[model samples]
Target: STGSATTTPIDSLDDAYITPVQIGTPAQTLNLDFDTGSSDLWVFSSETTASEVDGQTIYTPSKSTTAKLLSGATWSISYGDGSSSSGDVYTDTVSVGGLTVTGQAVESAKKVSSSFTEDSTIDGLLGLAFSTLNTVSPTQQKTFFDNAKASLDSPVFTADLGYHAPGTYNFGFIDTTAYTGSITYTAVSTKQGFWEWTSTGYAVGSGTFKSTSIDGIADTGTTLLYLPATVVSAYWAQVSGAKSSSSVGGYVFPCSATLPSFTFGVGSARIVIPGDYIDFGPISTGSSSCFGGIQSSAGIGINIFGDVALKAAFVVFNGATTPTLGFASK
Candidate 1:
């Protein structure tokens, strides 16, 4: 059945958004981050060491009659920020947005990096990237969507990542009411197993939209906007008193600074981001300095259009043969 789910943005120090999902036969409910940058459905489970379990809700295969071990199989995954998890694999029923996918491959964590252990209220990550990126050894594992797509009326999902508010993710259809203006379409290249695209170009503040090509991924799991070094430097140069802080790790500026708006080229459409949104709150309460929500992806080689950027526009993650993307005003 086609389904939809509300994506609640938990207080993760203003990090990522998570959604409740059911795994196993009797259904073990857990809060999982719907990450588009990676592939694999892994959970904090019985396989984890006591020390690694910490405050996460564990998935107990013994409790689910439908759970079956995939003999000799294992999984290991790491994020760009170095967060990682490794574990064993199992075949079980995993449900999301009211859609049920039986015999889904579920990874149960035996080891997790501090990022997973300490993250508030996230028990696992449900990857939406290409199944080719799944790290399971011996054989590849398909994602919940990949397994459910053929049965859907249309193999598509839409993401509405709100700004500091709860949003929604819909499956098998597009909710036209969720966005305004015409949905500008862009062809996506999944050779990298990501929703990767090249923007016609971008500009600092109200400056003329340059026609340069910026290759980047629309990552819901990522927290902020990361662009090329030159792009970042140009944007910050417009803000007085904005400078890079060694300790802050990104550019910090006066909280009172009236920043300029940023723009991105989407065919003939221009996606505008208000300057105020770029100021990622104060670095600390009552502090005059603020951390920039935008930063340099210089060394990373690829730019990332994270929550900061995606929230400013409505994004569509198409599962069609062409694997296109549609952007519109929220």
Candidate 2:
């Protein structure tokens, strides 16, 4: 935990990680994705004509007394998975927890047919990860952070997870009470609005796999860790009696024994990913039963340390003070 400060008023009322915004009022809870890679807050609206919209929750503005759609503005987003959604822009009084921010910009999807809509767990995405990856506005006119910065009590926002569960992503004031040590801030790369970083090395079972650590970035919007194939294969081999299982995508050791602990050095900080993270069960077909920490991504040039890695630490993006990323213990 960092140091505690007197709670102050925050203008930005939405969480960056998990967007728990109301459809029309405070009563109807809609769990959406707060994406920094994208600028728009899209929800499956009642006007959707796609037949694939199942298990996903839709927002109805007619039920809310405060919802208003923007005139002459339409929005569409496409993912790498080839799924897309098109809709109209809307503004409404949005609130998270006890704080409420009026005229929050959002998109009402009229057409959506994607895997996101089929999954019960993933309802919608709230793009707060970064401005460079934003799907809306080619020139990037507005960002969720830029628009809501004034309402935030402090310039910093902290991310905290609920163990293995979907954690509460807090905004506004930084909880100084959460960290005991001083935060070391890293300068951000201006090119992509991404936290550009260099890796020191990777270790598993008390042994360093490769001396050449890979360079990468930390992204909250991404869900999985993308690592080089050699590093992933080397680490998995260290697990005692570990073998590739078809059930999981990486590698898994039998239930009778415990897997070895793995660590990755990010600059001066060392991040230890426990064995349990690697023992992830298979969630799809033809995917090897593998650990969640080590994923095979030889083709993907840029490595992304996703939520699984971020959950272990308290991260603060100090955009207000300086363009820097700060890390602390949870």
Candidate 3:
């Protein structure tokens, strides 16, 4: 059950490429997004002056005996969702899992927007997705991996997202105890930073949808499964007593009935998305009705099967060992 990779490069303010590597642990440190699309670990800093930045955990460098700041270099980032932040560049003695890397480069956001400030639970984003999209300048393009690669036991890092459970996004080494066996490697496409696959159509309530082949990508940054619009509609219609509702810019269904099992074919591999994911309800006013696992994304060019789908399986992004992605059983 190995995962796949896509060579999608994210454009950043620094105009340099960056790759994402998992932050193994943040005992008292803030949480980060670990995005591959962007480089540089940006966190809410105690020095932030923006009043809109609220709810998030601010990194107090004064409290961290190991924290170090980069002099004179400052940076900022703005996301598509209109969220933005600016901060000074700094270095710290950071540890992920049990591995410690001294003088790791990171960003301390001095100014932030409301979107970032409101998420108290979101400490920060650990950009572990890719290197080509780094936000840092060319002089500081490479991240911790580039500097610490020589010291890593395997010279490779893998991300095993525990979706709903507790697990370290393995860095520099894969904890074999968390996985079942050897990893199945998949070559990443160089065109985009997405893990693409060809699906032999889909199954709804134990029935296969249209037989036309479907190709798409898997993304962890996204939180929901965005499937082909028509395919999603067809599958949802097959669920017993399923009713559709709209929220959070997507359609969702409420089927109290026992939904059927659904599967997608990735070459010879069959990936399953349970029904509970399909029949998910709304969590908030602006929140999309939990489509459970699948929903229609007619306009979005790429299919981003988010974390909910990945939670069902064990995934390994082996960037340290090999320039490849791998998947396995948990």
Candidate 4:
């Protein structure tokens, strides 16, 4: 039953990487954000009022013969970016690529925040985190992976995010051909529903790598890389025009400024985050307010290897007696 799928980027903006998923008996397809930071398979549906709905695609449950309400079951979720969604629950057949899970809990959104409604192209989210962290009340539900694992050749999945291009989310096995160099493995602490790991150390630019341990999570759903305030300050100090600008909403630098590359120590393989990715395009369209992709994790508490950092490596999430993460150069 092992299977895999090629992930597609939302746009050239690299806002987020999404994959096509099918729900219901016949298959109502939707492009969903495959997130490793949370657990909830939710979608925009007929339940949402027409006026409230924007240009987004809607999933109609009545069209699916297999759809059955969970009877008062409901779910809601909030992300670090202040994006949220809440809705009722139903059990139906859900499939990704060739893998399929029947009776999978599908949260139907009746209420979505403006942030979510704005991304009309993104129909919903397909959470890939551990099922224990599901938000459904009374009894939590398993994620699509949990339900499909028993039939897979191996309980493993991989995230290959791209910069200004397409990537992949392979299930059941690692696609070795997708990357170069030997895959370096590291033990992950998943108590927080994320692919959490302590980096061996890091170095800004060509500076020597240090032995300091920075505990952080690898997340594709988030847009930027976040580190400790002290570390962020050190990196910004090296940039001539870099400064903490409240008006710009984060550390900003002259678009023409020369920025240094960053490196992360993962096992013996050092993953390098190019300064170009850290530049993060611009704060506003047609504006000189360029924003720094690397920012202080003031309220985030934990460090984050978001899309900006993840595009630099190929990540494998191994689920066995113990969860482990394998990283390799792209």
Candidate 5:
């Protein structure tokens, strides 16, 4: 069996992407962030405090005949942004695109931080990371991808995130038409429960391809591309007025700046990110300066090739016993 779904950016700057997910017996469709960064399928629910609900959709387990409480189970997670959520657990039928999984553990949010509540575009998050990262207690839960891999015709999923546009997520089989040329396969290290891999090197614009090993995780949930400070400084130096601003957050430059394109090497293939994509967007409404899509990963601890990088190419997350990642031009 195979499943496919479309993901849309929640805002103009491509702040986040969301895909519709059907949960419970009668199929309550809710827009969920299919996050490859974390492992835990959590949702806003009737159990959530009214103040935390905001305008986001909530899963009403009481209304679903197939919903069953996961006795004594609870889960909690804190993100890099300081936002957090904790919840009790319930098992129900969950479906994404066309794939259905029965008795899937659904974490029902009892409490959510202000940031999550304020984001009306996201109702919940469907984690695609390895099951080892699940926050559920007593027993950790497998992600939607982990649980469905057995039934899938191929034990893998692909992410095609678009910039300010709708993209597609396909499971079980790859859409050959979605990409061009050949895919460069690389070994993945899931020691941290992430789709972490090492890139051959990178080139600033059309400059020399530095022979360096850049290690990072492919996170669709993250908004920007975070690389080592050295890499970031080198890229920003090319822009005349770009600077790292503490007040404005990370790197920022005049919105009128002519940005240079970014390229990262995958095996021998070099995938180019258009200059316009790195422009990000205005830091604030009517602001003259705009935030950069590529930022320093010094404080982040781990390098991340988020949506900004992912959007430039087609990504395949192979779910084999020895998981590997494949990158191709779109």
Candidate 6:
């Protein structure tokens, strides 16, 4: 069986994208962030502390006839933003789009970080990354993608992110109409449990293409594109009035600056990101300085081709025995 779904951006900056998911027998619906950066299908639930619930929807397992407690099972995971959630586990009928999976481990939240509580746009996260990254203890659980791969018509899924519009995700088969030209395939390294791949080079605007190999991960959950200091600095230097600001927490430039386009090579294919995508948004309401979408990943030690980069291309996550990543212009 194949599954298809649409993802909607939460904010003007395209900060995060979410999709609706059905849980339990009665089909309780909740909008969840389909994150490829982490592995933990956790949700806000009746078990969460009242103070942490905020305005987001919570999953009530007690209301579902198929909900079953996973005895002695527990999970805890911290995110790049330092936010975290952990709780006991439950097995229930889970479905995304029209594809169904029985006895999927659905982690129920007992605690959540302030950042999560403050952002009511997402009720929880449906991890699409490798199940090796699953944080469940005693017995780790498989991710939805991993568990569904065998039953799927094809062991693959594709992500098509948009700017201000809705994006699409199709599982089990690649929608050839979703992309232009042939997809360039690259070997993926899952030793770290990430969709990690290396780029042949990068070009700032229409300028020269640097022939340097840049290692990075395609992370759907992350909002910004983070690269090495050298690459980030080179891109920022092309924009007038651009500078790294501690006050702003990253590279910021005049809102009126004519930003240059960013292009990264995938095999022989060069996917270009428009300057408008890199302008990000204002540092503050009415502020004249805008945050640069491309930032330094020196601190994190891993370059992230997040939404800022992924939105520019059609990406395929092939979950076959020997996993690989496929990219094509759209």
Cα-based TM-score, every candidate: 0.96, 0.79, 0.76, 0.96, 0.99, 0.99
Model 3 residue 36 CA deviation (Å) reads 4.2
Per-model CA lDDT versus the true structure = 0.88, 0.60, 0.56, 0.86, 0.94, 0.94
State how far residue 323 of model 4 sits from its true place (Å). Answer: 0.5
Tens-place lDDT digits, model 3, residues 237-265? 77644444553455544434566666655
Q: What is the alpha-carbon lDDT of model 3 when measured against the actual structure?
A: 0.56
In model 4, the Cα lDDT at residue 216 comes to 94
Identify the superior model by TM-score, candidate 2 or candidate 5. 5
What shift in Å separates residue 210 of candidate 4 from its native position after superposition?
1.9
Q: For residues 1-330, could you state the per-residue lDDT of candidate 5 as single tens digits?
A: 999999999988888999999999798999999999999999999999998888999999999999999999999999877889999999999999999999899999999999999999999999998999999999889999999999999999999999789999999999999999988999899999999999998989978989799999999988899999999999999998999999977999999998999999898998999988898778988999999999999988999999999999999999999999999999
Encode model 1's per-residue lDDT on 77-149: one tens digit a residue: 9899988999999999988889889999999999999878887589999998889899999998998888989
- The better candidate by TM-score, 2 or 4, is 4
Every model: Cα RMSD to truth? 1.5, 6.0, 7.3, 1.3, 0.7, 0.7
Candidate 1 at 151: error in angstroms?
1.3
Cα deviation in Å at residue 123, candidate 1?
0.8
List runs of model 5 lying over 4 Å from the truth: none
lDDT of 2 by residue, 1-330 (tens): 121211111112111245566556745577676543445677776766657577667777777678786677777778534667877766776555545556766677787765666655445666655555544433232454655667777655565543344444566766677665655565566466566566677787678544575766666665556777777777767766666555544455544456666676655666666666444443444444334455766556677666556655667766664566676655
Residue 314 displacement (Å), model 5: 0.7
* CA lDDT for candidate 6: 0.94
